[model samples]
Target: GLLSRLRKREPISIYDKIGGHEAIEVVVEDFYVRVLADDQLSAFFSGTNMSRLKGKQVEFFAAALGGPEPYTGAPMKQVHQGRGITMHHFSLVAGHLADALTAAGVPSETITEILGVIAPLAVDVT
Candidate 1:
């Protein structure tokens, strides 16, 4: 007899479908470089800890992409607390991330999927 009938169990999530942890590392680091190049965005990063930020970002993105890690950072809203970050700032960073993912060879369709995952962040991140 064969056992099967799993309605709750699925094969793999979007995380594994697209490159997992490694993909986040590449995109996040590349993204920071891109973000710093923008004058408007560069100022906010003036006193940031790039190295530590990058690591946390990897975790953030991976988890956002439905990977295997809880984002250990503060809630997106709290993270932006007292920072005066606005929708404009959020859009700028979002654009950089999309560009970085493209440069990293992520397929357009997968990029669309990824955006769907993190697009909700805008409400809080804004």
Candidate 2:
């Protein structure tokens, strides 16, 4: 039944099926919206242009999600190297990501899958 449902779905490329650049853009935007508003994390984003951050996030997610794009941004550790991101901060980001995915209409399974992909990045981000 699941296979049939998938077969009947419009045949999109792996990238398109998994939410293309536009989808990634929404996720990044929604996530930052929460992060920028979160008192706990707001300071971290201070003076940061949310739009530019979202652009970087889109590029990062696109490459991580098996899209043809290559991530050319600064390495994770280097990007957040001097930033005082603790484990709690990292967890908060994860929570924000989950909320954003839900708002973006990502199915539960897909949300979980996406988290799995980004989990490893926490080490770099923090």
Candidate 3:
């Protein structure tokens, strides 16, 4: 009965439990800070205003994580469509994000879950 009931209802978005927009902003801000400081990825962000980029990231993640906000950024494929990102780049970004989450004191399970959610996007990102 519980399973059937759950199947019939709308799923609860993780963003809700994670404190919605504010919580997501925190995560994205921390993530970008790490990315900026990272010598490897820093080049990718060079000459870019990270504060503005951080806001875009927060909006992107908020919508992606299933919050009420709608994402208005460029499509993933088009955004990275011409970039020469390889599997290694994707792996590095994922690893860095995970590390940032850990440094921010996110629980291990939550970090794993979030990583799983973003893992599939590597297809387009890389």
Candidate 4:
């Protein structure tokens, strides 16, 4: 028997640490209230299907956090196209997501860590 294999921890993803698809769906749903409240950004998603968006977000975050799921959704660049997205818009949405995480009583340190993971996602966004 190989000692390394015995000692190695299974690759636990952030998705699992944070909970699975269901957790993401809950968070996404919570986040939308704040995001959609913003008149500036609401228009962007106004006609968009939030149900589909939530599902895609689940897939996207799942894939982002090292889950088995593949993010087959539009690339980040295309996802915000024609909607004329900007860093300001993206930052607002990011804040709302962070707020949702905190409202769930996720530890502040963990929230900080997750925000770090979400940082570069701005590139894909805008």
Q: Model 2 Cα displacement at 26 (Å)?
A: 1.3
Relative to the true structure, candidate 4 reaches a TM of: 0.86
lDDT of 3 at 8: 70
- What residue runs in model 1 are displaced by over 4 Å at the alpha carbon? 1-9
Pairs in clash, predicted candidate 3: none
Question: Which of 2 and 4 is the better model by TM-score?
Answer: 4
lDDT tens per residue, model 2, 1-126: 224435877444334655687888888888888988899999987787777777888888888776657887778899899888998989899899999989988888878887888888888888
| lDDT values, one for every candidate | 0.81, 0.80, 0.76, 0.79
**Cα shift from native, residue 50, model 3 (Å):** 1.9
Model 3 poorest 10 in a row by lDDT: 1-10
Candidate 4 lDDT trough over 10 residues, lowest sum: 1-10
RMSD score of candidate 1 (Å): 4.7
What value does the lDDT take at residue 60 in candidate 4?
A: 87
Which runs of model 2 end up more than 4 angstroms from their true locations? 1-15
Clashes in model 2: which pairs?
Answer: none
For every model shown, what is its TM-score relative to the native structure? 0.87, 0.84, 0.82, 0.86
Q: Write the per-residue lDDT of candidate 1 for residues 21-117, one digit (tens) a residue.
A: 7777888999999999999899888889999999999888877766767989878888877778888888888889899999988889988888887
Clashing pairs in 1: none
Q: In model 2, how large is the Cα lDDT of residue 75?
A: 80
